[PDB]
Amino acid sequence: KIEEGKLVIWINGDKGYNGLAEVGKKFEKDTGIKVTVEHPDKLEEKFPQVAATGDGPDIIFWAHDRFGGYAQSGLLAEITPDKAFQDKLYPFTWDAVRYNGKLIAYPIAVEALSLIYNKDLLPNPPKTWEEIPALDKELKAKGKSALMFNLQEPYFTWPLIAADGGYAFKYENGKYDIKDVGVDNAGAKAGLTFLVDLIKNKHMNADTDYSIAEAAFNKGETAMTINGPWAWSNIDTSKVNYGVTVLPTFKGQPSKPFVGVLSAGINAASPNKELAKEFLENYLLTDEGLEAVNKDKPLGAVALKSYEEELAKDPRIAATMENAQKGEIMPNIPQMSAFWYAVRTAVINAASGRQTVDAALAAAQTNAAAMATLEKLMKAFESLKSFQQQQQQQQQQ
Template identity: 30%
Template sequence: MFKKCFLISMVLVLAMGLLAACGPKRDPNAGQAAEGKPDKLVVWENADQGEQIAHTKKLAAEFEKKTGIKVEVVPVSLLKQQEKLTLDGPAGKGADLVTWPHDNLGQAVVKGLVQPIKVDDSVTGQYEEGSIRALTYDGKLMGLPKVTESIALIYNKKLMPKPPETFEELYQFAKANTKPAEKKYGVLFEAANLYYTHFLISANGGYIFKDQGGKLDPNDIGLNNPGTVKALTEVQKWYKEGLIPQGVTADVINGLFKEGKVAAVINGPWAIRDYQSANIDLGVAPLPKVNGKDAQTLTGVKGWYLSAYSKSPKYATELMQFLTSKEALKTRFEQTGEIPPHKELLADPMITNDPVVNGFAEQAKFGVPMPSIPEMFQVWTPINDAHNFIASGKQSPEQALNQAVKLVKEQIKVQKQ
């Protein structure tokens, strides 16, 4: 899942600066031709999902049979892998391949935990361009993608037979089908979270960091420009009119949807199995157009990365390619339900003929990768705090956003010192 709420800490900022010097400094491709074949490679897989571990272990056995190299799969929580690699890497106990959401990539590079990989165009060309872009940092490819995620419109077909085509139609549907006294709502989403409001911000001309020819400029922040103010003024209207209750959480939204009290929610694929357990006839569709534009959601990509401490970068990269091959990602989808960012698989009937999965896949085509530069670390808390001030009516969108962006810039300045 890609929702993040980061706690800003001076200690952590300073620690990041120190850790940047901790990773081994090497050319990842130097001497690969002469690299000796290892007896074993170590992979850290997501400890929080048993199906993912089981699938990677199955692939590990196939790779061993094919190459003679044993692959040890170790369960480690996604958001704890960087911390563990910081300690285990220098001690020679770290993994060769690690994995986490791409928006944590910038921190890993700053800490010196990962190294670039070298693969040819025939490899990178297999994947959706956005997924490769998400795993590229400062012009260098740092890994290969295995999963892509985006929010979309998930609806109860009994309560919403056909999804609205425009955001204005969605708003009108919400007004007509919301009865707060009965805890019944037309549409709910976490509207006090940048991850969920980005599509409105983008459609109105706002942005997080300015994209300068494929490179994000952390000095140009568009989260308080007129477009963002307009977008969050719209969000504030939903709260003022009671279409979204104050302080609503993901658990409350999910509970109400499963009870049949909400016609539609804006959420991600991680919620589907829980919703299906409630025997709801689900539909999934791309978000409705905003101002005539396709809704640009923030997409998340989970990838495999090559540890900076790996003593076998050549063979570890071969293993990475094996784990992200068409065949591997197809069986991963079949076993875990995770959507592969592979061009041929996204066009495969197993996805195109599955209306639930295809709804997310179609939305992902309009998505933009969450920024992975280290400065993004400083954005989430101030901007989400501003969202909350706007939702509660304590501040106008302009006041809240100006204050938040000022804080973001101050924290980025401290981070760079």
């Protein structure tokens, strides 16, 4: 059971739940219905457990990528907003919340990687990657460096690789093509090669992770870094006079960073579908709804569309939205588990000298068609595990 009447909501700890409950109070003054906002620990792991048994929250707030696997299990119900409501949110944020063609959640907040620069050492950030080598030699002569960001992660290095033409899976007609992997193409090729060049030319260090790079920017040792909204707090406390802006273009093409849309999904087994429907649409996805959640903990950029235009006064946020629009939306499929492991090695192999661009990229393509496609076969290890649970609980109890 999931209690017919009260709307129980599950949101992550680090989000503005008090600002959400503040909205949940204005709901119960209107149609009377009591709202309980719980923030359970490891809820992205508890939800797939209790929801399967027909329990859990009415509404779940989490990053869209994880909703795919939920929608695969039939844990989420198809939402029903009209063409009128669908337009007061950003067109692209609707592609983030679709599975098999059905819409399975409402978009809330967008999050993308942005260029972060020290105004003191560089009052005018570079619009092209091409000029970064030349810029470094200008700064090295003064002891500083041009750019420092996490090279160990594909999430950070992908924007450059993807820039010219690289992509995870082809998204066309509101659906994902798992037999169309663009990690090997001419765009990803020249992309990685350029990164590899900036490494052997001695402009970036192959061993740089997240800690080394953030510390360097928060020390004033580097003029630029690539990072998202989460880092902004630390950069305040170090008191570095910094600005956030659009990502540098490569070959005359904008960098395409991955998009992280926070979304609200309705439980399939919830009996209060028309109440959640009323909750999220009429109230939360208006200025007054979001403004309440924002004041508790900032959401960054938002899907509505009236309200972000108001927030867009802060350049930092307007820079997140602008990067989010030019980027590709992080695919919500189980084959995305693969792509990550394929590219993480490909970027690390190529950057160290172990393999070449051509080689390490073409190797990754085979490794994707290995991982998540065989890991798919290891799903039957749980199907055939039920034989274990059956052979004990049908025989006896």
